[PDB]
Amino acid sequence: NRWQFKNMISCTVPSRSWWDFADYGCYCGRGGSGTPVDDLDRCCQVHDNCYNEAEKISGCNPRFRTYSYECTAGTLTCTGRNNACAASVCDCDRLAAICFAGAPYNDNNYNIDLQARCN
């Protein structure tokens, strides 16, 4: 669920609150449109697509589906106790939290003007 995805970000980017990703670029944070401003934003577009697939599973609400994971000294792991939905969702979040850790944070891309830069 949404809350768990915050802990994954906490697990791979311990120096950053999850609020720095809440509204960054044209994708990180709700909705999403236009061309990704950078690498970090591209991680979030991918994450959205991922969620969009995970929703094809019957009755699968990514944002609420509580899954089974483990964060060990930096290493994220989706255990096998998850159902097709939870299993998918967990993977969408894991690959996203690692993608953020890999990308560089452009402070000038935090809370940009959506209208001007994302149509």
Partner 1 sequence: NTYQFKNMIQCTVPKRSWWDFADYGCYCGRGGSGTPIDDLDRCCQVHDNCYNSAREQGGCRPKQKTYSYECKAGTLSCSGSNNSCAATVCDCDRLAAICFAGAPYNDNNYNIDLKARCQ
The residue within the footprint of Ca ion, chosen from 3, 14, 22, 23 (CB under 5 A), is 23
Give me the catalytic one of 47, 91, 107, 113: 47
Nearest CB to partner 1, comparing residues 37 and 76: 37
3-class state of residue 30 by DSSP: coil
Rounded distance, CA 79 to CA 4, Å?
14
The residue within the footprint of partner 1, chosen from 31, 72, 73, 80 (CB under 8 A), is 31
Nearest CB to partner 1, comparing residues 61 and 109: 61
Interacting residues of 112 by C-beta distance below 8 A, sequence separation 6+: 24, 25, 26, 37
Verify whether residue 93 is a known catalytic residue. Answer: yes
The amino acid at residue 49 is N
Instruction: Based on the shown chain and the rule CB under 8 A, indicate whether residue 111 belongs to the binding site for partner 1.
Output: yes
Interacting residues of 34 by C-beta distance below 8 A, sequence separation 6+: 26, 117, 118, 119
Instruction: Based on the shown chain and the rule CB under 8 A, indicate whether residue 61 belongs to the binding site for partner 1.
Output: yes
> Binds 75, which of Ca ion, partner 1, none (CB < 5 to 8 A, cut-off by type)?
none
| Closest by Cα among 78, 100, 79 to 10 | 100
Site residues, partner 1 (CB under 8 A): 17, 19-20, 22-23, 29-31, 55, 58-59, 61, 111, 113-115
